[PDB]
Design a protein around this ligand. Structure first.
Ligand SMILES: O=c1ccn([C@@H]2O[C@H](COP(=O)(O)O)[C@@H](O)[C@H]2O)c(=O)[nH]1
Ligand SMILES: O=c1ccn([C@@H]2O[C@H](COP(=O)(O)O)[C@@H](O)[C@H]2O)c(=O)[nH]1
Ligand SMILES: [Cl-]
Ligand SMILES: [Cl-]
Ligand SMILES: [Cl-]
Ligand SMILES: [Cl-]
Lengths: 209, 209
């Protein structure tokens, strides 16, 4: 129920930390901080080295045509799933779903974000973004640990069978236990990778879980 | 280090047994007995239901053009890797490697088989099939548990970094421990799925390992 957000930017440190906490996870979320610094080949290296599932945290938010290209490159690189923003609309999300279907991969729909600014425009559209996901057949979602009442509403819309993961635990203020009342898994980055002992930090989260 | 060969033909029994032994594995080898009976959709169902890696045991052995089509359908269905026969030659293997590269997936090269008949024609070509794999850049191989001296020779050719899995353990007479002196993982089918208590059978193998 714990996903590591590996946002370190240098390959050596990323490999060190991921290896140290491998026993407490099986899924690593890799995003642009690491990929832009070390290249897309890092995805296949991680998948092979650690035998974990890899979720690409690219939160695609372009027009349909470009979203298709990004998804294809991401799955070609070996990612098991890609996170997609829902605010750009149904056609942009459908483009990602089409490529995931073609390549036997998964799409996670980001519905409401965890940072303070998410309240400005995203929050007001979040319920509709989640309903759009349900209408499109999306089965994997991302919602905020920092707002459990919003996480509850998201779970209500997507149902119990849908898979929901949630960032914002630790550094941003979210609580593991409270978040897991609604999400199937929690995403944790800094609380683990910036810790003096990442393995102990992960173990401590697991214990409370 | 244990891969389940799930060759039961009915979905209910396959799901039952795989769920019962899930804690002892993380990789399931699915082949034609199950796929032809329940459809290719069973691959994605297993991947989702159990969160395990899926190796498609199709041992592709056609001309390049057809091998390409089979590999594409297999990866579209969600398989993480596909097993390919090496006896048909380099072009047939290259066709599979090309699709695996396009889709961010893996190819396992079957070099020598485990049954008695493998001594008739395959064994005499096995060393060369393995060398061909090395020349083509193959990093994943399949060799026989029933002939550890042959498994040793295969390991010698492919090197220590290559990943080697081995069927023939249990029902066919192979030994877990002896096989693991050379292979990274053992494939076990009947000894587990036909057992009165599959979980206990898997646990017993794990203990001896
Ligand atoms: O609404 C969202 C969507 C994505 N992330 C991402 O999830 C991770 C959370 O990291 P951290 O705050 O645990 O360090 C980071 O990769 C971050 O970009 C959020 O934090 N909130
Ligand atoms: O040389 C080979 C190649 C493949 N398999 C396959 O590996 C599995 C071994 O099953 P079992 O003998 O443990 O039941 C089966 O799916 C079988 O088709 C072998 O046994 N030997
Ligand atoms: Cl993300
Ligand atoms: Cl972004
Ligand atoms: Cl096989
Ligand atoms: Cl066959």
């Amino acid at each position: 129920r714990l996903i590591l957000a590996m946002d370190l930017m240098n390959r050596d440190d990323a490999l060190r930390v991921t290896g140290e906490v491998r026993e407490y996870i099986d899924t690593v979320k890799i995003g642009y901080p690491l990929v832009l610094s070390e290249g897309m080949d890092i995805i296949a290296e991680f998948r092979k080295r650690f035998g974990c599932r890899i979720i690409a945290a690219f939160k695609v938010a372009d027009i349909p045509e470009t979203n298709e290209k990004i998804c294809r490159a991401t799955f070609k690189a070996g990612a098991d799933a890609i996170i997609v923003h829902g605010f750009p609309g149904a056609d942009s999300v459908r483009a990602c779903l089409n490529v995931a279907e073609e390549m036997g991969r998964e799409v996670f729909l980001l519905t409401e974000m965890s940072h303070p600014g998410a309240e400005m425009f995203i929050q007001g559209a979040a319920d509709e973004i989640a309903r759009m996901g349900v209408d499109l057949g999306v089965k994997n979602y991302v919602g905020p640990s920092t707002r459990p009442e919003r996480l509850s509403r998201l779970r209500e819309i997507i149902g119990q069978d849908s898979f929901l993961i949630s960032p914002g635990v630790g550094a941003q203020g979210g609580d593991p236990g409270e978040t897991l009342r609604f999400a199937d898994a929690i995403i944790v980055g800094r609380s683990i990778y910036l810790a003096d002992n990442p393995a102990a930090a992960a173990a401590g989260i697991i214990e409370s879980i």
